C-alpha cells in the first residue's frame, strides 16, 4: 500500500531529530501532504513524528 502523510502540528519546540524526520519525509510546510511509500524506513520516521503528522493509508 501507500501513505499520505500530512503535517498538522508544527515541529517548532520538538527535538532536532523529530525535525530531521520531517526533512527525511519531505515535509516542510504545515498541512503539506506527501503520498509516500509504505516501507519500514519511511514508516519509522512517520511513527517518530506521529504527533505532528496525520497519516492516510491510500493504496
Amino acid at each position: 500500500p501507500r501513505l499520505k502523510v500530512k503535517l498538522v502540528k508544527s515541529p517548532i519546540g520538538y527535538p532536532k531529530d523529530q525535525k530531521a524526520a520531517l526533512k527525511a519525509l519531505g515535509l516542510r510546510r504545515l498541512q503539506q501532504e506527501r503520498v509516500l511509500e509504505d516501507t519500514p524506513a519511511i514508516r519509522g520516521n512517520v511513527e517518530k513524528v506521529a504527533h505532528l503528522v496525520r497519516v492516510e493509508v491510500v493504496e
Partner: protein
C-alpha cells in the same frame, strides 16, 4: 417444498421452434426457408463464413503475413507469462511462480514475469523476469525482486 413446487424460473426452459407444422404456426409449408433455391434445400448452402458465390473470397484476397512455421514445427523456447503487481496484492511474504499457478494467475509451463500494472507491496517476489517499471516499483515499495533462471 415438494416435487410439484419444483419449477424453473420463467424463461429458463424455453420451448422449441417447430416448423413445417401447419398454417397457424407461422412456420407451415416452407418451414421458414423461403421458396426455392440452394438455401431451401436439405443440405443448404456452402459455408457462409467463407464461400461468396464463386468470386475470390474476401478472406482469400487478403495477403498472408508473418512466419507460419516449418516442419518439425514449433521451436521449443522459454515462454513468459506476465503477471501485474496488482495481482500480487493478495499475497503475503513470499510469492514464487508455484504460488501464482495455484492462485490461478500464472499458467503451468510458463516462466514468470512481473509487469508493473498496479501498486507494489513489500513482498518477496521470485520471478524469471521483471519489467522496467515493475522492478522500479517493487524496489521503491520495500520489495525483494528475486531474479530466477
Amino acid at each position: 417444498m415438494k416435487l410439484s413446487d419444483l419449477r424453473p424460473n420463467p424463461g429458463a426452459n424455453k420451448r422449441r421452434k417447430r416448423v413445417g407444422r401447419g398454417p397457424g404456426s407461422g412456420h407451415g409449408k416452407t418451414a421458414t426457408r423461403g421458396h426455392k433455391g440452394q438455401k431451401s434445400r436439405s443440405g443448404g448452402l456452402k459455408d457462409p463464413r467463407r464461400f461468396e458465390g464463386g468470386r475470390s473470397t474476401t478472406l482469400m484476397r487478403l495477403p498472408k503475413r508473418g512466419m507460419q512455421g516449418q516442419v518439425p514445427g514449433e521451436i521449443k523456447r522459454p515462454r513468459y507469462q506476465g503477471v501485474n503487481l496488482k495481482d500480487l496484492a493478495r499475497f503475503e511474504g513470499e510469492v514464487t511462480p508455484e504460488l501464482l499457478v495455484r492462485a490461478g494467475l500464472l499458467k503451468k509451463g510458463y516462466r514468470l514475469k512481473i509487469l508493473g500494472e498496479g501498486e507494489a507491496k513489500p513482498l518477496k517476489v521470485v520471478a524469471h523476469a521483471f519489467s522496467k517499471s515493475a522492478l522500479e516499483k517493487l524496489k521503491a515499495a520495500g520489495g525483494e525482486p528475486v531474479l530466477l533462471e
